[PDB]
Design a protein around this ligand. Structure first.
Ligand SMILES: [Zn+2]
Ligand SMILES: [Zn+2]
Length: 639
């Protein structure tokens, strides 16, 4: 039996508490002690980042031959899959030994152990034989004089940082990239009129302009050819300012028949005079008119100027505007097309291609842990801390400070409401980070997942969605493989007994549907607030509170009905450019982020409470809320 990969949903908790002055100690003592914690936090970031800078040079490069360094790369990241299960030592200790050999902190002697394959031994030699940058020599010169336990922690935190951020995202991207290429080739074979020559022509036009966006914010080629003042980008709501203004005038100051016919009578008036109006509206018109000239900032003189008596604005907002001139970008495109009338025909088809197939999905780039976002925490393990939950005091032994000696702090007491009380768990480690200038400590302890009735992991359902079937065009294949995996690993008759909560998120109201097998059993109230309310892409993140709070309601309702499976709805696919006022593409982008966040929190909690999660595609319809029940039938594949 070849050993299995570590879980991604970890069976562990960290409770974070503010570090406080210990009662009877000067603000100055605290400050000097907090200064020592800050220096150790920053040194730990420097050390992990240094290890990452060294390790990341051996990442496999897409579509290239495996380097001889690759086995060491794979092992550093996930040592457990290459070691014997009956190893007397931990994968963490084995990683330490491989790292020391590969970095020349030690020799290959430690690697004579049969725990290590020859492939590993050979890969580690290949790493050690390479010249080291000055930076790596400085890092290894420093780490050589650390205690083994601190080096082990460093290696573990760097390896886990790289594996969990970069490597998962890189593996998701590779499959996304591979399938995008197959979908591109098929779309091009099915639309052969968009030849390479034509694509190139448009590509060069959009480079010459300076359009780096997939989705071009430019009037259609053919609208642009009409040669009128009609852009959909220049105004507010695809009309001039005056057209918007007149609409407020018509709601605020006009009444009865005047709301309809004032525009018409004003143009009749301007061209042919008051006596051209019906006798019975001359009176009201006089008043409506001098009011009109005041609410807009218009003179009757200059209005008589245009086309023999015409108002310089639309009469409705429900019509294409002729007073809304084209943006400078609309006009440059128009200039490019005028010397290329051959391209006009293919404008729309080329923009469809450009939105999907001009740019490959972005290959992830390695990111270092951020000090300001406290991406990582300094680890104090077995003989480097003490905790007294009676007097809420903690001792933290810095790296070179002797055994039994601690810097001592109080901390915000463990809440009584917080379910694992210190006495019903064991603290394996304390984790130090800073939020701004303020020190925080995390008490780390193990909580096993409740066992699911499904003999399948959430990690398998995620791999189906992210690797096996990554494209939107593969949604149907994703849902079919997920349903099949879930039905085949449910112990009984899934179609009669599988307990499922469906919750419809987004522009489908706050309703949930409980199913037993394929049978809709009960609809349940669910009090969610929408993304419209509660109002460095931001830092006023009240999404996090929105996500945690709304996640908790979904989980309570699921647990209350001994649910096996939570089915979520993803957010509506992205509309085509134009009829997207800048503001509403920001608000659709906040929705997507916030909803991503609710799904992740519900998933993490669900796996802890012995459940599984599946996110179905946005309910595509072609006036009451049946939506959660429809979502469940979509899962079962009746719709
Ligand atoms: Zn335009
Ligand atoms: Zn208009």
């Amino acid at each position: 039996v070849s050993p299995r990969p570590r879980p991604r949903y970890r069976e562990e908790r960290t409770l974070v508490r503010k570090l406080l002055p210990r009662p009877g100690q000067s603000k100055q003592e605290f400050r000097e002690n907090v200064k020592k914690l800050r220096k150790a936090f920053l040194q730990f970031n420097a050390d992990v980042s240094g290890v990452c800078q060294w390790a990341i040079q051996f990442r496999p490069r897409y579509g290239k031959p495996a380097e001889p360094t690759e086995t060491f790369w794979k092992f550093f990241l996930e040592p457990e899959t290459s070691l014997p299960p009956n190893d007397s030592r931990s994968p963490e200790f084995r990683r330490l030994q491989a790292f020391e050999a590969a970095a020349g902190i030690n020799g290959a002697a430690a690697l004579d152990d049969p725990a290590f394959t020859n492939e590993l031994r050979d890969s580690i030699l290949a790493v050690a034989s390479r010249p080291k940058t000055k930076e790596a020599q400085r890092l290894f010169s420093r780490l050589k004089d650390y205690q083994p336990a601190h080096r082990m922690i460093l290696a573990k935190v760097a390896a886990e940082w790289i594996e969990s951020r970069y490597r998962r995202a890189h593996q998701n991207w590779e499959r996304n990239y591979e399938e995008w290429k197959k979908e591109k080739q098929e779309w091009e074979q099915n639309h052969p009129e968009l030849t390479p020559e034509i694509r190139e022509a448009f590509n060069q036009i959009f480079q010459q302009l300076e359009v780096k966006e997939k989705r071009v914010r430019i009037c259609p080629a053919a609208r642009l050819l009409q040669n009128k003042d009609n852009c959909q980008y220049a105004g507010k709501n695809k009309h001039s300012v005056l057209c918007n203004q007149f609409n407020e005038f018509k709601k605020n100051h006009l009444q009865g028949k005047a709301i309809k016919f004032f525009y018409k009578d004003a143009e009749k008036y301007l061209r042919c005079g008051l006596q051209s109006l019906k006798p019975n509206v001359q009176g009201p018109f006089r008043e409506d008119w001098n009011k009109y000239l005041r609410y807009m900032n218009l003179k009757e003189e200059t209005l008589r100027g245009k086309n023999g008596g015409r108002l310089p604005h639309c009469k409705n907002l429900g019509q294409e505007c002729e007073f809304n001139p084209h943006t400078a970008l609309c006009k440059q495109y128009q200039q490019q097309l005028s010397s290329r009338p051959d391209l006009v025909q293919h404008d729309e088809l080329y923009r469809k291609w450009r939105r999907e197939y001009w740019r490959e999905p972005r290959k992830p780039v390695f990111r270092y842990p951020s000090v300001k976002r406290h991406s990582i925490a300094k680890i104090f393990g077995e003989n480097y801390f003490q905790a007294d939950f009676k007097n809420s005091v903690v001792g933290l032994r810095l790296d070179s400070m002797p055994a039994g000696q601690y810097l001592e702090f109080a901390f915000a007491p463990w809440p009584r409401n917080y379910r694992p009380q210190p006495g019903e768990t064991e603290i394996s480690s304390v984790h130090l980070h800073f939020v701004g200038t303020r020190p925080r400590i995390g008490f780390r302890f193990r909580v096993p997942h409740k066992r699911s009735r499904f003999d399948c992991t959430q990690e398998e359902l995620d791999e189906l969605r992210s690797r096996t079937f990554p494209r939107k065009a593969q949604d149907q294949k994703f849902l079919e493989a997920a349903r099949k995996r879930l039905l085949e690993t449910f112990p009984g008759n899934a179609e009669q007994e599988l307990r499922l909560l469906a919750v419809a998120l987004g522009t489908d109201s706050a309703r949930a549907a409980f199913f037993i097998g394929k049978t809709f059993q009960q609809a349940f109230p669910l009090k969610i607030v929408k993304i419209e309310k509660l109002y460095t892409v931001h830092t006023a993140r009240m999404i996090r509170d929105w996500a945690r709070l709304n996640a908790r309601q979904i989980i309570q309702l699921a647990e209350e009905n001994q649910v096996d499976l939570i089915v979520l709805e993803s957010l509506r696919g992205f509309r085509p450019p134009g009829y997207e006022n800048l503001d509403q593409e920001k608000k659709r982008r906040v929705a997507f982020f916030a909803h991503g966040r609710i799904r992740r929190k519900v998933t993490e909690k669900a796996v802890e409470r012995g459940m599984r999660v599946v996110t179905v595609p946005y309910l595509a319809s072609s006036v009451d809320e049946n939506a959660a029940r429809v979502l469940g039938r979509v899962f079962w594949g009746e719709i």
